Design a protein around this ligand. Structure first.
Ligand code: HEM
Ligand SMILES: CC(C)[C@H](S)C(=O)N[C@H](CO)Cc1c[nH]c2cccc(F)c12
Length: 392
């Protein structure tokens, strides 16, 4: 079996092997850094199967030494459950994490983007769009939504890496930091239970207490993954998207000349940016299933390489090209089926607001160094820049 990942992720470059696999052997046996061997899935159609078809299970991973890139299995909360447990947590969030809640956040989100740009301008160029914009923008938004104090960032931010680190932390460090984040959220819930605020943690604690729907551990682990998703995934996709726009200056000119392309632009960034470094979380087969001529037997795992699905040339014409006018775009950047992203309306709002605000306030925004000089964050499950220096 081939050793996987084949190569360490570099910048936003996609490994040429994925295009060879999609064309000649779309499903291949690999050996994983931790846990059992697995079947690597690379095509769009098979990706939809293993993400949505009831024959593939997340909860079965707990009965195995789960195929994975991280030293220990991650506490994925809702994303590690099947029905009926998944349905219980999913229904809870649907009732408190509504579209109206997200749309009512837009004035505060727009105000935070303007405040961060005010600070960038007051401090003068060169600025850092990562630590000086994407990180605190994503962070204040999710902290506002969830009810985690943004002022506690100095203590919790150093724990989040333990949910994503692949090669850069020991299992002892991962266990300690995971326990520290859970313990910190647990103490926040004691306060929020007694003194509810207009945020998601309070609403979840209240909805769960009234119907005894979730245990305290389930609530703690769920709030934790929402904080990782809003703080880390959003800021990573935002900073990678800015890198894509800077390195495709003709598409950036088109976006500034036709601002109505922004909704389609965000979707094409979701598709084109290979945000997941390699694969998302393993599923396990409950029955024999044939995928692209390869038989996956019951009890075997499949790794969904979502970035490769989004480059599938049988689905997206010129899949290797970034084209923000692309109309047909059934990308899997937000997942598919039972576990599809429920933060996607908010992520879409943040991306649109962030990019509209930057292009509106800083019309001359350009990268301050050659892209070869940039430093990327290695050893994580998503790709992100450590710094993006800009002039204006
Ligand atoms: C641009 C930023 C984001 C991206 C790219 C993203 C992407 C994804 C993807 C690909 C999945 C599916 C994972 C899988 O099937 O293995 C997912 C699931 C999920 N995302 Fe997001 N997400 C983002 C932001 C958020 C935000 C802001 C939240 C909420 C605060 C969130 C909450 C979730 C949850 C709860 C799930 C699991 C749903 C379930 O298990 O039923 N995400 N996301
Ligand atoms: C999930 C993908 C976007 C990749 S794989 C990722 O960022 N994964 C993160 C690091 O492993 C964990 C994560 C991000 N959003 C989540 C929502 C529910 C449970 C979770 F565990 C996560």
């Amino acid at each position: 079996p081939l050793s996987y990942p084949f190569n360490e992720a570099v910048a936003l470059d996609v490994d040429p092997l994925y295009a060879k696999l999609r064309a000649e052997e779309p499903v291949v046996r690999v050996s994983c850094p931790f846990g059992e061997d697995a079947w690597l899935v690379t095509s769009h159609a098979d990706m939809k199967t293993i993400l949505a078809d009831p024959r593939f299970s997340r909860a079965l991973a707990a009965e195995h030494d789960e195929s994975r890139l991280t030293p220990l299995p991650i506490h994925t909360s809702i994303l590690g459950m099947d029905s009926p447990d998944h349905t219980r947590l999913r229904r809870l969030l649907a009732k408190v994490f509504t579209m109206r809640r997200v749309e009512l956040l837009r004035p505060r989100i727009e105000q935070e983007a303007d405040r961060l740009i005010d600070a960038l301008i007051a401090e003068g160029p060169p600025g850092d769009l990562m630590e000086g914009f994407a990180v605190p923008f994503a962070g204040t938004v999710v902290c506002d939504l969830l009810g985690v104090p943004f002022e506690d960032r100095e203590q919790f931010r150093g724990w989040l890496d333990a949910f994503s680190a692949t090669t850069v932390m020991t299992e002892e460090e991962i266990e300690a930091d995971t326990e520290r984040l859970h313990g910190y959220i647990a103490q926040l819930m004691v306060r929020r239970r007694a003194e509810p605020q207009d945020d998601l943690i309070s609403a979840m604690v209240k909805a769960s207490d009234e119907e005894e729907k979730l245990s305290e551990k389930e609530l703690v682990e769920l709030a934790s993954v929402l904080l990782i998703a809003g703080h880390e995934t959003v800021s990573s996709q935002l900073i990678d998207s800015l890198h894509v726009l800077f390195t495709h200056p003709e598409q950036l000119r088109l976006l500034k000349d036709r601002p109505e392309l922004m909704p389609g632009t965000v979707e094409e960034l979701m598709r084109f940016v290979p945000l997941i470094s390699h694969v998302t979380f393993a599923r396990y087969a409950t029955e024999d299933v044939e995928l692209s001529g390869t038989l996956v037997r019951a009890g075997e795992s499949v790794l969904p390489a979502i970035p490769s699905a989004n480059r599938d040339e049988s689905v997206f014409e010129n899949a290797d090209r970034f084209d923000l006018t692309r109309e047909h775009n059934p990308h899997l950047g937000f997942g598919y089926g039972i576990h599809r992203c429920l933060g996607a309306p908010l992520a879409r709002l943040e991306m649109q607001v962030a990019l509209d605000s930057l292009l509106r306030r800083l019309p001359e925004l350009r990268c301050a160094v050659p892209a070869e000089s940039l430093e990327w964050k290695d050893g994580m499950q998503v790709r992100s820049l450590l710094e993006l220096p800009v002039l204006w």
